[PDB]
Amino acid sequence: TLSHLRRTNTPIAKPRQLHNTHWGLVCPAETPEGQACGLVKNL
Amino acid sequence: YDRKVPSPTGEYVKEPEWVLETDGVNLSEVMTVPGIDPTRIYTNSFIDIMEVLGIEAGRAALYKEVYNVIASDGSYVNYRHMALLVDVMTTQGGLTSVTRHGFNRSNTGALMRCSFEETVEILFEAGASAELDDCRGVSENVILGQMAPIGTGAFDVMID
Amino acid sequence: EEGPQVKIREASKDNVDFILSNVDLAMANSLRRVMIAEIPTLAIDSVEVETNTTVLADEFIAHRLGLIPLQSMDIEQLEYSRDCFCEDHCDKCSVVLTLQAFGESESTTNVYSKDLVIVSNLMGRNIGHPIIQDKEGNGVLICKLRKGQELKLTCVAKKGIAKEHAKWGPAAAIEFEYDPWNKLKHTDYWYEQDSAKEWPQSKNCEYEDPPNEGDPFDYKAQADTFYMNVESVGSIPVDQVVVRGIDTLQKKVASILLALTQMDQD
Amino acid sequence: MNAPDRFELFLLGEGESKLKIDPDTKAPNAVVITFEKEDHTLGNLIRAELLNDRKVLFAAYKVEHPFFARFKLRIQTTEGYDPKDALKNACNSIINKLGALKTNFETEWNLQTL
Amino acid sequence: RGNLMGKRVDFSARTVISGDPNLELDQVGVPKSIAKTLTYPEVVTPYNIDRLTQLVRNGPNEHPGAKYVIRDSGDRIDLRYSKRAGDIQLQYGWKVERHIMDNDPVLFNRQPSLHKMSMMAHRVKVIPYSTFRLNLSVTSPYNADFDGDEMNLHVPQSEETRAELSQLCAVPLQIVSPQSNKPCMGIVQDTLCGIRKLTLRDTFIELDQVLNMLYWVPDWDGVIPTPAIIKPKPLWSGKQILSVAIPNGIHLQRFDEGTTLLSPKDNGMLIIDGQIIFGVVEKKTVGSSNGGLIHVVTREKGPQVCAKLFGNIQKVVNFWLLHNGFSTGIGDTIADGPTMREITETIAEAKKKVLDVTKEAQANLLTAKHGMTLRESFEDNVVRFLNEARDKAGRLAEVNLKDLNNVKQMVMAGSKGSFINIAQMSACVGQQSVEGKRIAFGFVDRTLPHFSKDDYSPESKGFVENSYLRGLTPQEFFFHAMGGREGLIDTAVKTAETGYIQRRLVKALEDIMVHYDNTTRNSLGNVIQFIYGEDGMDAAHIEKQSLDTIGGSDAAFEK
Amino acid sequence: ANWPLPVNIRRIIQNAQQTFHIDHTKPSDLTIKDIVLGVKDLQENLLVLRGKNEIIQNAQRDAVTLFCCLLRSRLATRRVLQEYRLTKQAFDWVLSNIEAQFLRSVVHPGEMVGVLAAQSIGEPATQMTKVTSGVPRLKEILNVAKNMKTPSLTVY
Amino acid sequence: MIVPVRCFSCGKVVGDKWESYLNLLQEDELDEGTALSRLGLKRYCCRRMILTHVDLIEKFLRYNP
Amino acid sequence: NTLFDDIFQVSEVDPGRYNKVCRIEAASTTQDQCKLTLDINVELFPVAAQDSLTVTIASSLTRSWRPPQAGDRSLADDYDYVMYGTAYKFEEVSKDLIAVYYSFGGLLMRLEGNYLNNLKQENAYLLIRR
Amino acid sequence: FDMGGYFIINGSEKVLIAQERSAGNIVQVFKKAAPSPISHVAEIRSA
Amino acid sequence: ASRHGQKGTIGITYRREDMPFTAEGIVPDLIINPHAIPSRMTVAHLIECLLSKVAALSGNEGDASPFTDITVEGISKLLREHGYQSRGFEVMYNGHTGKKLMAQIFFGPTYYQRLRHMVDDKIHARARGPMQVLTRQPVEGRSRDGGLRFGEMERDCMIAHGAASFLKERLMEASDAFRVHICGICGLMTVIAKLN
Amino acid sequence: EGLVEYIDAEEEESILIAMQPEDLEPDVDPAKRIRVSHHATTFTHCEIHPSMILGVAASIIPFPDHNQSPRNTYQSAMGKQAMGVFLTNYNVRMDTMANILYYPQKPLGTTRAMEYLKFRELPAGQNAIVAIACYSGY
Amino acid sequence: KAIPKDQRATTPYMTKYERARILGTRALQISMNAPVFVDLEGETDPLRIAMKELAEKKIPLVIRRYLPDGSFEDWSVEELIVDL
RNA sequence: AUCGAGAGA
DNA sequence: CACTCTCGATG
């Protein structure tokens, strides 16, 4: 429930890759495996 | 590069030679350069090979490249398979791609080619050109729900 | 006597630490397996729920009831419901005990195993009584009621085998160790540097002689001495746990012998 | 949902006999006995007790599948010695040892406190 | 593509699969409920009228039974609602739709069905519990573990089609596949680790256990093999009792490194007439290798004997392993103190080297390699240095591991794990990378806000000195997270693009087969190959053989 | 030297010197004519194509050329008599067995080898993890890329 | 939910020791280890069985229905 | 009957990553052209350096292995350490040097000699005493 | 223990997933591809 | 699954007798395979086991927080103080025979969780069921007693096998087999077949 | 009181962050992990705690710094599929389908972040006495 | 048109597809209580009976092998060699 | 059944 | 361009 309540979705150069700026803002581990990988993120 | 060369005494010995690798391709003018052996020159672009040395050399280079892709992973596929693929890509006279632009433009059955990528338009131009479907294709007997001429159905059974 | 020997190192109401001598490994093992799985015990096998306004689910509570240890002293003169010639169950095969709890006080009203009340006729047999090793005399905490919550149910306890369900398990953990010095070399110890220093020394090492480095490996030696500790749950006293374990093993061997006796028929 | 009843571990089914004695076709004077509704508890014990009989050439038990509570016991004895007699002697030996063990444990229990 | 090239079918089942050491290679565990559900139409003949009558008498809900009875008129009798389900006079010519029973041919399948070995005919074995049970050695061609994997089962509905399954799609007939002219099945996991453990020279087995293992082989002749040791105690070696599983007439020879017939390291492999002479049995032998044991047994004794061989090997090895035990803990990831010191000082001298190269490049003394930037030369040098560091430390850790080390044991057996696993767990996980380069500057001139700008040091660009045993620092954790992320991304991308490539290949080479003149043609009759594979041979019956005339001196050739 | 070919001759020979139990200290009852003409006549039975015209026969001798090189290499007089030390019976058994296995090794007509090839390439392409290699390169090849990512010229 | 009646692993009764455990924690002000020791929970499976338990029923009883 | 008989002087003992089996290297105290290599279960019959082991190759003392009953049976050994294996290679170093390779359940053996009646037979008992 | 942060539509609990977008009013310069006639582009999304 | 991406389904269930056991009589609730360790490199699983063991014995709460100075060596020392092998190994005995196991087993408490995927919610089997209306093919779904898609790739497999009759059977009898009438002239489905 | 500050990535670009408060201070344990000494001086901010880089699901993972990152991802995915008490009032809610663990247990190995995620109060799993062993091969 | 019994160029050996097809057809016939041309000797399974009927060459069927040009060669089951 | 969403390998 | 269960709103 907590995980779902803090979720990020992204429509549509490398939006999937874990960017450096994601540090401390978005969890590096938690992301769905497959098609929505890197696009769906968690705070 | 290290290279295996027949020794004058008989056996094979490692005879190392200097080989020039290259970022960039222009086979049409590099092989005609005085100083190198123009009979062993090679490029990973089987396009240029096919354009300069012929369709057979293009076939050999194509196989060499596919096999290189397979073996680079450490895997191993028997020769006849990749050979079959390359042969099918190369029998039309040139380099036929494995896409909706390549083999799907062949003069085969309408239903077969319609069972892949461009479906409806194939049937459209088939109806517009009044094409005859031999129904000896696999997917065509698959559609008709009949025993296709495949392995077990590659013949007939009668009584004597 | 003349055969396998026993030496009770420690003995209590709950635990028996003893030493089996002059026994084969298979017999000790099988005795353990029987003591764990194949000793008859009385436990709740049926639960009829009339009213249940408690938080817990019906079959939840029923499960907890099933796990309750009941007196299984005279269990050998009780019968299996499957063997009894009665309908469903009776007094010769099962023990019926009720449970009526209701939230009375403003505070939480606890429901213990002591609140179970025998209804059926025990007719002399020491059986059915829920074990209470609790200090305050309550026993297993079955449930908790609020203020207006009620639990009304009836329990039919039947004779059962722990092989069928673990709730009929008369024993807890059976400690089992032979050859504390690994003189038989049944175990190749994992180590980083010094094997002996890393692995803790067993208590049973006090009861055998350490190997001499001048002596080679004894390849002809078997496993004779076994250090065991049998723990009971209360349904059956420890001594009777191991004794009825032996009796059961012997009995089911005798059943095979009897089968052989019967296979001679034309 | 597809789980078998638990009593099928020890309760003999319809028509299922306890012991199924079959002539072994491999080696001469050998036998394979199918024990139903039994496991390692009886198998390992009987097998181990059959290796004590010096007139027994072969003795081995196996549980072909842990789903079903049954095991096969193969016994090969010397000529002039029926394997069923070896099984019987093994069983009786077991029973005697267990009787002695029980008696000893009982006499040892009476000499204890607490 | 959705209703013609493929469509949902009747007489199909699907369930979570699980492994079973006591099922044959070509068997499939089928849950009782599924067996009750799926049915087969069997025509009433004098051969089976009694059996079918009994099956009908059992009806549905009880296995083995029947669901429906079809008469001459074509009317369908429902055996669960019919008032005459009790008394039925089965006439000849009638059909009885009976439950799926043992040894019925069924098509086992796992998606994605990438190659023909993804669909193979198995023999039904009705079992309790609700899982499709399969043999471990059939895992590889299906590519399936048991962590929630589900498989499908299709039941043939006539004699000719189940004949097709039993004679063409049978699992033993698929052991040696024409994909790589080698067997696609072998001994794996517990059986592999265990068979490596068993065939050690230190491994001896005394009488009782020997008798049990001997009896565990169904193809045992009942003859007790004379023990390798007579006095002062009858002991059998692992190789000796394992040899019983291997059929007679099976000769296998393979030299490894220093294998000299006496083989001081017990490596290589020599097996004479189904009796292993010497060599530790592991993946090179009992695996799915080219000229391995499975390939030889298949080509010599036949597919049936090879499947049965899988069975026997599995039974014996699993038995021994069960009563021997095998584990793995954190202790198997711990190298000695001095080893860790050498690892740390190795990473130290590596970082020092990188520091020197950095200082050199900053002094504008770094001469760029021909054809690339000074900066690219620097990057290449640093990356190579850090890689050499990881490999060095990892090799130190690997050397330090004993033969009793469980991880190293699984590595030796070829059952699981490799060098890089030991390296990254015990020594140093190494340099992380994204898009072929080390961690780029996401922020201006720096990778993280914890570093200063223009920091090209190893720890700044994503080098992880620490191992998984030691624990990763926050920076290392995030950089490794970036790398791993790229991994998952290009993994999904890979399975997608491959998924497309395979379909394209199939649809392109679809209508091609060998005709009765050994000519490889298509539906148009166009010659692709005049002789199939240029030699007219089936890939399955092809083995790598040496042409010992192409090599050697002319003197040796003459001699 | 190591190349995939039908009929494992080594296993056949080592099965010959196992079935007939020939000792390495006994004169073979063979003859030069037996071995030479025997092997030379064995090659005439290794049939893949079975026409009666010149073309098909040429294709036949072309298709079995390699395997016949292997055959001549393994079944040379010196090798058979000295290394193998086969007898007449054992030699004939070897020839018969080789012919049999060769005939077994022939591809069966009706073999859907197009799909077989496509799967034999596609399936290992699934377990795939400085020029461009791997899956993207395979995609370039199959698409016949007009502009490949890494055009390289190897000059000797 | 509520304290498990018996230990999963071995089978030792532990459902009668929860209140005693709580008392040993609050009344005698002991630590969890000693409290678990005095209750005769030597094996770490039972030790776990009580230590690891969360008494959720005490919150469940906060509702009136 | 008996096939070979000699007294060897153990010159080396090598526990090559083992803990129950060592590779022993010895030589004949009779023939100056005879040597021996042998895998020995040290846990059963310990072999220290510089030992004079009496070694014998026999062909007898097929049928299944009966347990040693009673006996009351001709053991035909009274040695200290007896094994049973299979010859698999007859290496010819020279005309005056012929070597044989025995395999005792994986415990290999290389015996180099000159003058032998050791045929490639399953019958291969290795008897060592003192 | 319920933390809220969701809605209840037709008795069904609903969560609004945070939608990621590009920041407006930000000046960004990007290099164009090689076949492109234009080499660099300075764009801004006005809000 | 464990708390480290180590997923797996139950292969079988053993009663306490058949289960291996330590000298204390402790039996595992769960048995996992060591082959699921070295390739995946889930060291944190093992460390969690060690820490949980020590915490169980000492009655304390194991701090398995990410970036702390808690090391396997300290946990090992603590475990050794409690009288066990510092690396979590314990000498176990085979349940079937009672004989010791040669190798010692990594044995201890580990937090496992039960996932939503259970067999009886997955298990599906259909033999002639409800069809669709448009295509007259088996419906989609386990709850609707539907069939399973014999897809394109499966078809490709059966082609590779050469099994033609099976392919036809899957695509006719086992699915939507229909009989139509065709005109001998134009060859269309214009035929009005007044049967009987 | 100007003790804590809110920083987004854009402003994060212009600051220097200390990883631990012990990076402001001016013979070792071979067991502990190797940590690079602070070569930077001009700090303007310090991380509250590095473990706060994780989300709710990954904060349940014990020792995630001793794991391979894809395993942390996988665990993060599977944590949402574990059963247990999702809410205390589950008995007075009419959800489409719910699963409650019979005897939920607070993990023996926890995280400092679990305290704020209410995991020890509402756990999703049990401490199972696990044994890593090749037993019957099942 | 046709192809004469002499000058037949196809394989004298029965293909595995021909074998499977023949065994399948014969089993299909036996499954509908058709006459058996071999001694059952205890066998009841139609496929097995078809196999035994194949080993004795008692299967009155004939394979029509189709060449790509349209030509066809007829090979009786009795004539074809079964080496598989 | 038709369109979106979560997730299983 | 690349098999499932499921949920939940819509005609």
Ligand SMILES: O=c1ccn([C@@H]2O[C@H](COP(=O)(O)NP(=O)(O)OP(=O)(O)O)[C@@H](O)[C@H]2O)c(=O)[nH]1
């Ligand atoms: O070389 C090998 C050896 C083994 N494996 C097998 O794949 C696993 C790692 O490789 P993988 O990336 O395929 N992992 P996967 O099996 O897809 O999922 P998971 O179970 O979560 O790891 C290993 O655990 C093997 O089962 C390979 O894929 N390739």
Ligand SMILES: [Mg+2]
């Ligand atoms: Mg896997």
Ligand SMILES: [Mg+2]
């Ligand atoms: Mg899987």
Ligand SMILES: [Zn+2]
């Ligand atoms: Zn009664």
Ligand SMILES: [Zn+2]
């Ligand atoms: Zn316990």
Ligand SMILES: [Zn+2]
């Ligand atoms: Zn018309």
